[PDB]
């Protein structure tokens, strides 16, 4: 079981929006953008940290910051689960395939950090799609380390409530001084408008530049 | 509003647009980071306000060619005599935006004062649509929180979904020029890389060459 | 003459990716696109010292990746999962005239000769014919286009309908100067049931290679 509360549309100023996001204007946008990791490399490299659930956590404390992030739609209600947990991709070098787990997310980086080698230990090898299965209070996130994309665009075939966010890294690159990393996040409009997704990757750019690792 | 119905049987995409409707229907996103540094220094220069004038930019780009301005009016292909840009603004109080039409005018000065009045009428109405909504519009939205190398538009249903739709991102300084994402959705049945790549290298002409009046 | 080309019928009871094609084929389905600023600065040098045209060479290029990975190369056909023997490039034509285009295929060859003879013949033979596909569609194309008026940092294309769309989609843009490098918008649409992340990551970075290694020859 696990927690939500109830959005009332009725008394909510993106009612008319919603509304139409989930009827006739129903869609979904991908934005890609070369975030600065330079600050952010050089802490996870001092405190030897892995980079990947490093940056899976500073998104799921954002996921966990704003409630446009954590809609569904349960038992036809829109509601907002009160926290959400990454579901990652691992990938298994001897089959050329991937899966997704999901690890619990709490604030305190070190101790989703315990939770998430725990998680990649015990079921790093198991070859399901989903080993540990799904929930339903997740969001995405997927490692591309191949490719240093200027672009990276989302397009499901069946959008109807999928408000869950998606995120994709790209291979970080030197640019100057800089460590830039490409970063695509791909959101339902019937939740997250220009406005919440830019003001979480300003958010996450800062949060980048000034955690000090711990 | 009134409009040149296409005559189908002498187009020369026929077979596309048939295509384009049907089997291979399709729409597609692009983004360029658009040189404004000319653009920009003739807005300040003559204290304008950037974003009407680039919506106006824009405008007279979609009432030059008729590509842009086909809808499906009562089952038949339609060009219409002009299209009005529908442009966001953002209430920063609610966090939540709105979509709103200014009549187009060829003229810059005619349409900065029509923008302005629509501004300055129907901005703090919270409504999605505070104007409602007309037949002949394409869209226009603002961004300026990311600057980013792609902005994409997935819509759910694309049937008849003719309007050009451009995103304006977050401008920034680039060794010596100023670039500013921008991105352009289109339908398949009415553009091609062509018209689209058209149009972009006009955009980025009028920008240089703009003299702010 | 005609070639129809072979194929093998696909096992998805011993495809590692089962699981995941079946998910991709109905509840999870999707497409995706990226794109990448390729590096061109050797290959264009090639391409000018050796006096071709640019776009069949590209296009070769391409074909050879296609046709090294079947990934690549899958099709429903007859209600099977199939791999097809080879693909062919089906790339695009521009009518200067009427502003309008068509998609051309050429037949595939291993060799670049051999394959800028055929490409050189159907651009000769119906570079003008105004026709959507001037030879119709075969089976088994992959499809290229040429958006030489943009150096986009994005290009992506929404199929509405992806049911069995496995054809690999490429879109080149227009090359452009940065420092010493000569760069190309390079923009790569898949499915997802017969491609992942790493199938299309490998290509890309394949692709960037060959593009550095080719020799004209
Ligand atoms: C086919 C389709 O779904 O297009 C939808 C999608 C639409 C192009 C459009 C109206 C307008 O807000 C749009 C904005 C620019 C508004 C602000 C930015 O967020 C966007 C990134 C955004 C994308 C698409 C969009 C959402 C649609 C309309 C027109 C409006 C009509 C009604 C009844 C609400 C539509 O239904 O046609
Ligand atoms: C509506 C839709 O198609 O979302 C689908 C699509 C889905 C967002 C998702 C689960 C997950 O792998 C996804 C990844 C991130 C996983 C790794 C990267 O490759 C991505 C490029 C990728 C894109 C979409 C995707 C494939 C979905 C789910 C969640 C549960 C998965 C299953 C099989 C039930 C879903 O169907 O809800
Ligand atoms: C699944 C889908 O909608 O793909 C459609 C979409 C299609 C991939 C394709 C044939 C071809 O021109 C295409 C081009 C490359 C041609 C030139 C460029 O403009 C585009 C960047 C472009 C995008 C998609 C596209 C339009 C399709 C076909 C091919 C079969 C033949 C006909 C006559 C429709 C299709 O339906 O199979
Ligand atoms: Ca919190």
Known sequence: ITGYTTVDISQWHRKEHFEAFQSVAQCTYNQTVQLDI????????????????????????????????????????????????????????????????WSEYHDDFRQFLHIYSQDVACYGENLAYFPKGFIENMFFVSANPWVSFTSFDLNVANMDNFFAPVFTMGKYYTQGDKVLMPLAIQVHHAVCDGFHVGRMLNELQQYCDEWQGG
């Open 38 to 101: 330079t600050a952010f490399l050089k802490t996870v490299k001092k405190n030897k940290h892995k980079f990947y659930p490093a940056f899976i956590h500073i998104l799921a404390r954002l996921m966990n910051a704003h409630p446009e992030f954590r809609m569904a739609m349960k038992d036809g209600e829109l509601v907002i689960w009160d926290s959400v947990h990454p579901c990652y991709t691992v990938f298994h070098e001897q089959t050329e395939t991937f899966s997704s787990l």
